[PDB]
């Protein structure tokens, strides 16, 4: 695997995906940011546990360490 740098984010909004290309993201779980610059509205996230990857809304995913903990 070349995409071994999985940038970690946390899903805040509980979003149920109806399409397989979309990712069902359960509020409170962990997601890996695959691509976040290919598109602005929808990003590529992968569920840490489920291993499912798909498109999700940008402002539904909040990167860990980044702005989640400055305390």
């Amino acid at each position: 695997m070349a995409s071994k740098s999985k940038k970690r984010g946390i899903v805040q909004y509980d979003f149920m995906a109806e399409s397989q290309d979309e990712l069902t993201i359960k509020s409170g779980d962990k997601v890996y940011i695959l691509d976040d610059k290919k598109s602005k509205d929808w990003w590529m996230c992968q569920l840490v546990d489920s291993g499912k990857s798909g498109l999700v809304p940008a402002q539904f995913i909040e990167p860990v360490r980044d702005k989640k903990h400055t305390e």
């Binding site: 149920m16 109806e18 929808w42 539904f60």
Partner: protein, 76 residues
Amino acid sequence: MQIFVKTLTGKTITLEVESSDTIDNVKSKIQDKEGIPPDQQRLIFAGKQLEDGRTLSDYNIQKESTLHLVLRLRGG
């Protein structure tokens, strides 16, 4: 009523719409307000993606709530 439809770009607009209005008509209101293609507009409330042919009531959306408006890759 007034719903806070917050676009993914950060444009949070207060939309005056009827509780029994369709999401279709809501998109028309936004298309009047800001001017965005309805097909391109995906309204997400509490993680529930709203269909055009359904109303605010069909998804049980109370007034003065914040809906997230995520656009398709139609505008990109």
